[PDB]
Design a protein around this ligand. Sequence first.
Ligand SMILES: Nc1ncnc2c1ncn2[C@@H]1O[C@H](COP(=O)(O)OP(=O)(O)O)[C@@H](O)[C@H]1O
Ligand SMILES: [Mg+2]
Lengths: 637, 119
Amino acid sequence: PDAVFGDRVRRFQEFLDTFTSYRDSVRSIQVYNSNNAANYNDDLNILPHRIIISLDDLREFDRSFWSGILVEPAYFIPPAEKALTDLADSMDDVPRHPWKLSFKGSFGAHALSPRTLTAQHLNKLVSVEGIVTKTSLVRPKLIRSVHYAAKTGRFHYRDYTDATTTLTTRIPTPAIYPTEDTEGNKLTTEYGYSTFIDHQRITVQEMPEMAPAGQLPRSIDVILDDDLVDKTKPGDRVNVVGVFKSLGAGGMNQSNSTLIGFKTLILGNTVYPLHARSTGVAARQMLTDFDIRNINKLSKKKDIFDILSQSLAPSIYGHDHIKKAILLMLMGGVEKNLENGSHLRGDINILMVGDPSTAKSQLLRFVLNTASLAIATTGRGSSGVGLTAAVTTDRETGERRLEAGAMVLADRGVVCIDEFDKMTDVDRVAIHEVMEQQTVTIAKAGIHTTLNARCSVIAAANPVFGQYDVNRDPHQNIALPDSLLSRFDLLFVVTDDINEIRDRSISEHVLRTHRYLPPGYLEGEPVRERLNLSLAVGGNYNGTEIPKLVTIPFLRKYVQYAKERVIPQLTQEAINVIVKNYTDLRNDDNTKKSPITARTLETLIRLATAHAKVRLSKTVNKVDAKVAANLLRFALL
Amino acid sequence: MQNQQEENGSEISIEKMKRYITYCRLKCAPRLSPQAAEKLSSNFVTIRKQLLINELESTERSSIPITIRQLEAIIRITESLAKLELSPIAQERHVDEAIRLFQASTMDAASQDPIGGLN
Ligand SMILES: Nc1ncnc2c1ncn2[C@@H]1O[C@H](COP(=O)(O)OP(=O)(O)O)[C@@H](O)[C@H]1O
Ligand SMILES: [Mg+2]
């Protein structure tokens, strides 16, 4: 027993007393585990025994203890964990693993980067942001081994600890694996009674958006334990909160005698997968009951399909039907997985083609900025292996492995392809399978696999003559294969027609856009840039809290709520409308920009389903079918 | 001659220009005045009206196009001129010389196109 350890335990007990959010979070975890255990006993998931602790509240309570965790975490984190474990055991008397801590809040000088991590931050709690590059295989580490002596019929056990388990270094006592007891009888290892804890080691290097553009990047190893494994994948942007520790002796023993120095790594306490632009982490955000009530209130209005669409990009004049299409693509439709293995698309693909300076790249950048999982690519910039997948070799195992391209990483997301017309032929053959069958089939040397690539694709292209010509046929203007055009659900030809009143309207809209101030900025002060990192849980300017037009953070809340909550089903009253309109479209005499196939019918079904998602309606109504048809006739005629 | 002109003050040194452009970019980001918007809109519709009637008479598309990106180009030139004198707001005199420079750069290039001329 140590007096200062007990004093710090009592101080953290007072801290947990004055803030009850940690108390009823512990209640929530315990009642979830107990209810799952009772359901398993009568008729599942087990939450980890760890609690997020806010450093700001701790600084408000005790500045000395907060500075102790930040500066000397090895002396302050274990007393806090013991206090949390004692509190949990005191409130689990009526209904065994020790409770761990996790940290959120401002870190100040300890919010660092793998370049900025130096030896002055050793034995300190650091928050390090970066990109995950190498992710080791999750390996079980033996904690306690259980053995059986058949001659005595007795079960024995041995506990094992290493330097990474504990923040405070103790005497290394290597207890070997017992195969004979103290009487000499042979021991049989009891697999299944021994305990194993998952262990992982990830490599976090500095973000390419924040690394210097010339030189090599810096990386650090992070050790993760049983509940923190498999929270990241290579390519994720991450924030790791943990203790920066040094291990071993840096050649200062006789046996070691080399200048690796002291091996340095981060004992991970908290892993936040951050969402960045064009990455594999989807932006997910908390829906407060006020926002849910607001979403349900706007769901009841009749003009909502014209409010959400016009509030997409108010900085672009016109292109209203493209806004409708982008909104319906963000809604995403409903896919059908059948009992006989057949798959039907839900995702909606948009192709835009036409003259330059028609806000195509701007719309693609907006879709990149507003979607949860949008990934931006370019025709000649990416290749066939760039979009789908490629093959590499693992250093440890020595066997071939896969690197996921843009299409696999944007699964359940949006792929924004800029300058679609300049893609290579093998890339087109690759995207043919992805854009309909929703899969990437890899048949390379030795490995055969399929990867899920369920993606909405929005693409911008140019005509082969540079400007679209009215009198020429659309087949010569597009110059893309008919199967690829049939892949796209909506094809919008945008032409920069010159009219005096239209030109005046564009000019005034552009100038009113060009006379904007952010709040809290001066007349001559230049606007600053902060890189948008969002935590992934689980022409009027004054659009604020649903007045006339919807702000973008609420619009993505609406999109999130509609994608997670409502899954509409077809009704006959919409089906007759869709069937009649598809029959009219197949046999109409009017020349259309896009060919009419059986994919037009499923386009109609997906568009009606997306519009039903807009209204938050569990059934597809007739007005949904009418508006889904009328959006398609604008694209075709 | 350049040293004498630098001593007089009608030319400034290259390092002084470098640090002055650094200070201007980190300090001033001007705006268009509301009275300068009407002139920009009027001239941006007159040029495109001229191109429209020229394309209608010639029945052939012009080889050098004039678009909304050119309007924002003129805006950017005006705001650069206003950033020269560290002016938080751009007056009419910046707009006028931005127009004259746009005439000397893109409009004479378009007049070199026979489709863009014919007037
Ligand atoms: N309808 C419009 N409303 C507002 N700005 C526009 C519009 N059309 C073009 N622009 C402006 O013209 C510039 C050209 O970019 P963009 O039109 O996206 O190129 P592209 O047409 O090749 O995608 C953009 O910065 C955009 O601000
Ligand atoms: Mg473009």
